[PDB]
């Protein structure tokens, strides 16, 4: 019965403010409407045309996803990575595509993050899951953390203080990953010498390794499995060295067979799919936007409008997908109880 | 005839008395808006370099050039309010210091040549305010990132006027390496100040640069972790090496025959989170005048030492004008 409310029940934070876990549905888990650096879309925006270009392309690019069936989109992007709350809650209203906003810290901490302490990076995303993020009263509903192999002690810090911060809030925690290192396993022990629930983590990025056994290990001690770059492929540009080291030269139906492979050994509960998607990229090379959309005009419809068709037709239930994508987001993203 | 400041322009003979190296707040970029609570407050920060800049004008202060880029966090509205409210002049910078981000650190000479432009030529973020120099850093040899960074920042000079100002390993003469790159493009020496050039004691390395035409920016002479022997991070940061000794390469270069060469400075702060957490309490607590160092301690040690009125009035109103108006 309660699947059908929307008028009440618990809450998902949203650049809007508050949302029933009824209302997010079709839910992209990872995603960023804007991959940079801090302070630099304020500072360059003419890298990307302008403000007004990058907002009316995604914003286009939002209501392209929601016309294929998406309502939420969540924006794993870090202060680190350029998260501008501000504009994702522009282009979230203009798309009435729901975004769930991140804190946490990703692959390009500053100074003044990697000086930092434990308990003082806690503090930080306490800050902007409980308080808010900058001035704008928009608090963040899920956090971000990155290793790329073994992780350095800084982030180990990072790790730490994003389990307490989800201990302490109830909000979970989601990974990058060098997949092919393995690096879900670390990420597992750390989050696990904290006490943190492997069901509220998911390991991300991880449709970038072919090793089922690595995945399924995860997935049996509860870990949810991020598989997130389905459309991530440089197939057709060999030739571009650049594309070719970001996407992979893995198919994207490669990639979407491990979703089948993990629903077919029993690990559907435990899947989480996305696109790692983007509308503006300013943290590598200067055409690589123009370079993706070249190979994936569907952008984040990619997951509803190929994948979703591609597994149907090879015996995937549609009520399995609409759990997938629906369901399983819901449980990831509903808040548990605070700790004490 | 006219210099840019975080007010807007300014006559040349209105700048006065000038600090060429100061920071209001030694950040990265975005953290002072995401994160306030490190610094108590974005009040408490406004409140605490209101009080440091009104003191340094008190003792006859009337410019400060902040020479916090981008990346080290320059917050150009916060740099507004508290010249406003400080009634000191701020000239804000562009360039990029030690602590790029992926978005700048991919980027093109010729990218990097057009960010520092919009800066000087169009204004800093979506504020109208206007960058009056550019700043530039090594810490030895330069990587190739920083070699872009030094010919971007000769590029945007020689379009615009505006000086370059640099950071060094003064001890690794870093000097020499930027000064090669910026002849290298075609960059005047008078339009380069080397700074941390007071970081060494190698009067030979400064004397060369300075008979080439560059300014020599002796700008942390409060800095110094003598009393704090048993504090590694202070130590390793502000040196051992006293504010006298400092004070007296002033004097040497003056008597050297570099008197209109000389800028002299505090690279002081009012908050700090690039570093450890306590370093500006730390800092806060061997030189409580702050900017006012310079004015209130420096200036009466080389006045007593012989250093005429003149001289020094020279080198802190007639050379910041020269440097900082653009060509
Ligand atoms: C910023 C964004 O770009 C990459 C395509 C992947 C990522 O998830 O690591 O982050
Ligand atoms: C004092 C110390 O922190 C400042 C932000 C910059 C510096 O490089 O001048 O050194
Ligand atoms: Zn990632
Ligand atoms: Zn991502
Ligand atoms: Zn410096
Ligand atoms: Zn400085």
Redesign the interface.
């Known amino acids: 019965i309660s699947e059908f409310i929307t008028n009440s029940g618990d809450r998902i934070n949203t650049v809007r403010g508050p949302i029933t876990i009824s209302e997010a549905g079709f839910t992209l888990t990872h995603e960023h409407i804007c991959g940079?650096?801090?302070?630099?879309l304020?500072?360059?925006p003419?890298?990307f045309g302008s403000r007004a270009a990058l907002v009316e392309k995604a914003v286009r690019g939002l209501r392209r996803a929601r016309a294929a069936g998406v309502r939420t989109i969540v924006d794993v992007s870090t202060?680190?990575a350029?998260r501008d709350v501000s504009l994702l809650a522009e282009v979230s209203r203009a798309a009435d595509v729901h975004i769930v906003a991140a804190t946490g810290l990703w692959?390009?901490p500053?100074?003044?993050?990697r000086?930092?302490?434990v308990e003082?990076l806690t503090?930080?995303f306490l800050?902007?899951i409980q308080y808010g993020?900058?001035?704008t009263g928009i608090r963040a509903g899920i956090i971000k953390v990155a290793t790329q192999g073994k992780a350095t002690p800084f982030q180990e810090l990072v790790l730490r203080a994003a389990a307490r911060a989800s201990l302490a809030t109830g909000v979970p925690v989601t990974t990058h990953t060098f997949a092919s290192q393995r690096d879900g396993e670390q990420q597992a022990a750390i989050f696990e010498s904290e006490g943190l629930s492997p069901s509220r983590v998911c390991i991300g990025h991880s449709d970038d390794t072919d090793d089922l056994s690595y995945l399924t290990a995860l997935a049996a001690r509860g870990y949810l499995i991020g598989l997130d770059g389905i459309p991530h492929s440089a197939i057709g540009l060999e030739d571009n060295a650049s594309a070719s080291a970001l996407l992979g030269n893995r198919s994207w139906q490669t990639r979407a067979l491990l979703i089948k492979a993990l629903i077919d050994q029993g690990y559907m509960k435990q899947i989480l799919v996305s696109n790692d998607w983007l509308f503006g990229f300013?943290?590598?090379?200067?055409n690589i936007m123009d370079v993706m959309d070249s190979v994936n005009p569907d952008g984040m419809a990619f997951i509803p409008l190929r994948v979703i068709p591609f597994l149907r037709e090879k015996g995937v239930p549609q009520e399995t997908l609409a759990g997938i994508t629906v369901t399983n987001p819901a449980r990831f993203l509903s808040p548990t109880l605070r700790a004490s």
Do not use: K, N
């Open positions: 940079s650096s801090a302070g630099f304020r500072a360059w003419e890298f202060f680190d350029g692959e390009d500053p100074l003044s993050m000086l930092r302490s003082e503090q930080f800050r902007e993020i900058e001035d300013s943290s590598y090379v200067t």
